Design a protein around this ligand. Structure first.
Ligand SMILES: NC(=O)c1ccc[n+]([C@@H]2O[C@H](COP(=O)([O-])OP(=O)(O)OC[C@H]3O[C@@H](n4cnc5c(N)ncnc54)[C@H](OP(=O)(O)O)[C@@H]3O)[C@@H](O)[C@H]2O)c1
Ligand SMILES: NC(=O)c1ccc[n+]([C@@H]2O[C@H](COP(=O)([O-])OP(=O)(O)OC[C@H]3O[C@@H](n4cnc5c(N)ncnc54)[C@H](OP(=O)(O)O)[C@@H]3O)[C@@H](O)[C@H]2O)c1
Ligand SMILES: [Ca+2]
Ligand SMILES: [Ca+2]
Lengths: 410, 411
């Protein structure tokens, strides 16, 4: 019972509403008792984001680049109703957006799985981790209606005074609609770097979906760039790891995902990752059972968080004194994942040990049958759920806490 | 009570490989012995499309437009390999894309369910019917890699002689990639008309996914057009059946599809409908249990078929001379679906009842354990099925024929 320490620092980003109440508890019960982390702490509450005029958000991001690891609690992103609620003198940009620009990199969503908790998709046994390429295809396109008959044309004008090449796209007769989109080789090459680095670190294979049958050039450039890089830099390493990479056609990927056991990383384009991430996440079940995690292209800088929001509907009931059974595992797993990275970077196996315990002690505690209300509802259905079927949030943490001590051997 | 018939006509398209052999028995066994509806027959064997330069294809399209109701056996879509196998001439176009263009409107995939055959998604208790647009967008789009540094711009050049309209799209420094797509107001309008008609006729409610969050002008146009057309011609008729039209984003809709019981028509754009139809394909179980049906904008003209292809691999065992358990139920349902549409235009409640019992009989056939391999692998899983769990194709069709004549008697 020597409490574990570290050698580098861990950047903590505190947040809002219900997840903050949960954050605080976790640190008191599942982290600070068992381990001493140096923590550079930025408070990203809405209150304190407003007070520093967002400066702490940016400060937090740069710290993550200096130090190399960050955990983030759910933070409210301000909108119109929020500016009236919290009296903000500015509608500040979503802190994730701010953070993500500065760090750069790609977001991987990895769900936590338990035996007894069933999935919507019977086949699924292991994580399917979708990486999403955020730099714009349709998200930075330029769209327009066509009210007159006429002709939609595309010019590529070379900057070295060279001859423009132009493209007949369509001659409309009645009305219509037109669009143009783009992407960079550098944005793609960074998307690729992230993916290869994540899947390698995780010791999973990597898939890539495109529709390159139809868009032989546009979607072709993705397939190629991944290929260029793979057999250059990654193929030997993956092959030592017992993993691989293949490009699949998007039509096969959805079918493969449907039919498959799982246990792989799925890298897909901006639009595809956006559409798929929601069905996929639904299918695995509770949003408390999944974590986000941005990974820069080098693979040394990581920001990690639960893939749910500040779960406000519950933060009301907590204010009103009512019992609440918000699921804390995604939050808890943000800590363990993030601390793991820290350990893997500093080559620190007492800390890397701890993270393995907690991760699996959580799965044990639910696998045995102690679970928050949402998981009960997967097993037992939404009618049928009685109070003895779920622990509330606080008594679940106290339940993983004892079970952790049990497995503090070594 | 002997054999019955109807005054309107079916339009039979003969197809090729395994599905052509199943086709031959389906008729002789399950439908012709109990139903004698007139048939303007058109053979569409890959054989014959070489022998008439893809021109029986087009003839058949216009045959259906003229007559109102087609049924189609699967056909080969010429690969570069199929050229060497059959004959040179031209590496032809797809007879599906050929007949679909000629007739206009939209294709709706509808799965068939059996209580004892599980889905991969533990909530799908009712069918989910994707209608894919199948025109424009990324499927007729121009694309280019960008090797130099330069500007990508878009010009709209009016036909009348007016001012071009230019759009600065991007300025490349390194290398990049570019693209442009169109869709037309009259393709979305006919996409819309068909869906509203189809959702109505089948008494299911109608969703439409877009991305008008992102693509305000482009996707909005779709949103606005269904909104226009719903109010002005369908919103009344929908409420007089107890159904609704709603738009959702594509994110909610795929979250919906996954968590929802089913029993709706989901109009998808050309790219969403290609992708999503494949997730639904696998999720329901077997392509043996799904029919593609093509409805024109007016909704008075249909060409129905099976969602699967010719089942080449099975046909290869048929040539070795070996046993095969190819699932005919989609092909049979393709008949009972056309004939049903033939009946509701003749007001023929006799033929309408035959189609419903035949379908009821194939369902209870499978619910009492009599089934083909694919459905055996759907229950027991790929590597745990043995010969004693499934019937071959002949045994199966014969098993339902026996079951059919008893249900004809007891009434
Ligand atoms: N990481 C981030 O920064 C991030 C991301 C997204 C949203 N948000 C913020 O969160 C706020 C609320 O957004 P929201 O309520 O739409 O999204 P949400 O927090 O994901 O809540 C949606 C609903 O999902 C259920 N849920 C989510 N997490 C859960 C958990 N851990 N345990 C049990 N149930 C859970 C709850 O349903 P019931 O009502 O049935 O209990 C909840 O009301 C917003 O102000 C937004 O800015 C932050
Ligand atoms: N006109 C059309 O309706 C249409 C549509 C799509 C494709 N096609 C054409 O069909 C040809 C063959 O393509 P394909 O083999 O990839 O697709 P397919 O004919 O749909 O067969 C795909 C595979 O899925 C399984 N399967 C499909 N239908 C089945 C059934 N009724 N019963 C049992 N198993 C079934 C079989 O796998 P196992 O052998 O593993 O059991 C089969 O080999 C191509 O030339 C293609 O162009 C035609
Ligand atoms: Ca999304
Ligand atoms: Ca497809």
């Amino acid at each position: 019972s020597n409490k574990i320490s570290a050698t580098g620092v861990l950047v903590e980003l505190d947040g809002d509403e219900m997840t903050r109440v949960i954050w605080k508890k976790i640190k008191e019960t599942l982290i600070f008792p068992f381990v001493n982390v140096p923590i550079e702490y930025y408070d990203l509450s809405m209150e304190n984001r407003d007070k520093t005029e967002d400066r702490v958000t940016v400060e937090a991001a740069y710290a993550i680049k200096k130090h190399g690891v960050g955990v983030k609690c759910a933070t409210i992103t301000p909108d119109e109703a929020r500016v009236k609620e919290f009296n903000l003198k500015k509608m500040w940009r979503s802190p994730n957006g701010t953070i993500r620009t500065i760090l750069g990199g790609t977001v991987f969503r990895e769900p936590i799985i338990c035996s007894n908790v069933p999935r919507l998709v019977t086949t699924w046994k292991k994580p399917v981790v979708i990486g999403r390429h955020a730099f714009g295809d349709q998200y930075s396109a330029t769209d327009a209606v066509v009210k007159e008959p006429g002709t939609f044309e595309m010019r590529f004008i070379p900057a070295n005074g060279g001859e423009p090449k132009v493209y007949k796209v369509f001659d409309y007769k009645s009305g219509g609609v037109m669009m143009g989109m783009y992407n960079t080789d550098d944005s793609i090459r960074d998307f690729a770097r992230s993916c290869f680095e994540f899947a390698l670190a995780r010791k999973w294979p990597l898939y890539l979906s495109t529709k390159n049958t139809i868009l032989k050039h546009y979607d072709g450039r993705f397939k190629d760039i991944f290929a260029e890089m793979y057999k250059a830099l990654y193929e030997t390493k993956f092959k030592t790891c017992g993993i691989f990479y293949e490009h699949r056609l998007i039509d096969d990927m959805v079918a493969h995902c449907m039919r498959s056991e799982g246990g792989y990383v799925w890298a897909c384009k901006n639009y595809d990752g956006d559409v798929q991430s929601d069905s996929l996440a639904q299918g695995f079940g509770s949003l408390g059972m999944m974590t986000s995690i941005l990974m820069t292209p080098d693979g040394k800088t990581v920001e990690v968080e639960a893939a749910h929001g500040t779960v406000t509907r519950h933060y009301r009931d907590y204010q009103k004194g009512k019992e609440t059974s918000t699921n804390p595992v995604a939050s808890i797993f943000a800590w363990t994942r993030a601390l793991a990275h820290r350990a893997r970077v500093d080559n620190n196996n007492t800390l890397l040990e701890f993270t393995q315990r907690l991760e699996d002690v959580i799965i044990a505690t639910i696998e045995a049958g102690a679970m928050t209300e949402d998981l009960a509802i997967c097993i037992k259905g939404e009618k049928n759920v009685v109070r003895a079927d779920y622990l509330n949030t606080d008594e679940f943490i106290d339940a993983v806490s004892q079970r952790l001590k049990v497995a503090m051997q070594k």
